[PDB]
Design a protein around this ligand. Structure first.
Ligand code: 22F
Length: 126
């Protein structure tokens, strides 16, 4: 069901949360080799999450589930804010700009924490 596909998508989201927090620790410790690997892992995780969310939104649309579509349009928009900030963080790492990396990292945390009430609403709506 679309609901079970959303729970599968929620787990992937949580996998990225885990890898992100490991990555933050590595950054703070200056283990740049680890950071590079974690950033690659996050890129794959976010790409997978984005795809599952799109399939869920498209299904909710085909089902005529107007409230779920509204919530998923809002949530996917916020997901893209996170994606843009993530990509900027990756660029800051490439460039050696630790000040920008730190900035983008906190911002990505706040965008993600904000979006969690909506994430829980979607589970109930599908
Ligand atoms: O911040 C992000 C994000 C980070 C990197 N690429 C895409 C989304 C995010 C990921 C999942 C989510 F549910 C809300 C936000």
């Amino acid at each position: 069901s679309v609901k079970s596909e959303y729970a599968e998508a929620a787990a992937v989201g949580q996998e990225a949360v885990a890898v992100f927090n490991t990555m933050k620790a590595a950054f703070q410790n200056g283990d740049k080799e680890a950071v590079a690997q974690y950033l690659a892992r996050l890129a794959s995780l976010y790409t997978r999450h984005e795809e599952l969310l799109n399939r869920i939104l498209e299904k909710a649309r085909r089902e005529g589930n107007k409230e779920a579509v509204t919530l998923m349009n809002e949530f996917t928009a916020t997901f893209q804010t996170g994606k843009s900030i993530f990509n900027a963080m990756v660029a800051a790492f490439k460039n050696g700009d630790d000040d920008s990396f730190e900035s983008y990292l906190q911002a990505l945390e706040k965008v993600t924490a904000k979006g969690e009430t909506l994430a829980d609403q979607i589970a109930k709506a599908l």
